[PDB]
Amino acid sequence: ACPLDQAIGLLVAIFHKYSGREGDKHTLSKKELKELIQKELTIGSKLQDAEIARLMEDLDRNKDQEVNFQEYVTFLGALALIYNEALKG
Amino acid sequence: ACPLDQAIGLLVAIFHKYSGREGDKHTLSKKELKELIQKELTIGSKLQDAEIARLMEDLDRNKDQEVNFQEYVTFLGALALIYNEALKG
Ligand SMILES: [Ca+2]
Ligand SMILES: [Ca+2]
Ligand SMILES: [Ca+2]
Ligand SMILES: [Ca+2]
């Protein structure tokens, strides 16, 4: 695969690495998502618990306490905007 | 950098690489979009110009004939959904 497809593939793999641990196999519970963030996000392990909780809360748009793939994509987009904004100085 | 950041970072770097060719250094013209697709997407080199034109029409939400980073993020999300399905079961 080309660079772009590879990166997207890696992001999709990360989701499933954590979504299948408990409950529904295709959605992330509060526990799975927190673990994903602390282990896969560079600054994840240093964020306040309250902030991680707020982050997960906002990503759960339909309030079923799960973050499905579409809600995860929203998170990826937020991360991308953050990096892009920093580079534009 | 951790997995999430590495992948997101690369996707951001790819946008910046092709957006600075001509015109607005922060948006992709049709020609920049085409080069980006052809060189960074696995199926890019096989896509026809009519298909790139359709992609532009789809992604260009504000009608300026250019793909800004936000519209590019939407494209990335579409690709992620596609990849996610092949990984489901
Ligand atoms: Ca789960
Ligand atoms: Ca949800
Ligand atoms: Ca440009
Ligand atoms: Ca546009």
Spans of all domains in chain A: 1-89
The amino acid that residue A37 corresponds to is: I
- Rounded CA gap, B64 and B53, in Å? 14
The amino acid that residue A5 corresponds to is: D
DSSP symbol at B64? S
Ligand with smallest separation from the Cα of A19? 1
Name the 3-class secondary structure at A74. Answer: helix
The amino acid that residue B34 corresponds to is: K
**Angle value at C-alpha A6, between A4 and A11, nearest 5 degrees:** 100
Q: Does the annotation list A58 as a binding residue?
A: no
Angle between helices B69-86 and A69-87 (to 10 degrees): 140
- Rounded CA gap, B51 and A59, in Å? 33
Q: Do A11 and B80 touch (CB under 8 A)?
A: yes
Q: Do A2 and B87 touch (CB under 8 A)?
A: no
* Of A3, A8, A5, residue with least CA distance to A76: A8
Please state the length of chain A: 89
Q: Which residue in the set A39, A81, A83 is minimally distant from B9, CB to CB? A: A83
Ligand 1 centroid to residue B87 C-alpha, Å: 15
Tokens read off for A14: 């990360």
Q: Which structural technique was applied?
A: X-ray
Instruction: Give contacts of A67 with chain B, Cβ < 8 Å.
Output: none
Query: For chain B, what is the total number of helices (H) and then of strands (E)?
Result: 4, 2
Q: Do B5 and A42 touch (CB under 8 A)?
A: yes
Q: Does the annotation list A32 as a binding residue?
A: yes
Q: Does the annotation list B27 as a binding residue?
A: yes
Q: Tell me: domain B1-89, CATH 3.40.50.11890, correct?
A: no
- Rounded CA gap, B5 and B28, in Å? 23
Tokens read off for B9: 């970072």
Q: B26-29: long-range contacts (C-beta < 8 A, 24 or more apart)?
A: B26/A88, B26/B68, B26/B69, B27/B64, B27/B66, B27/B67, B27/B68, B27/B69, B28/B66, B28/B67, B28/B68, B28/B72, B29/B65, B29/B66
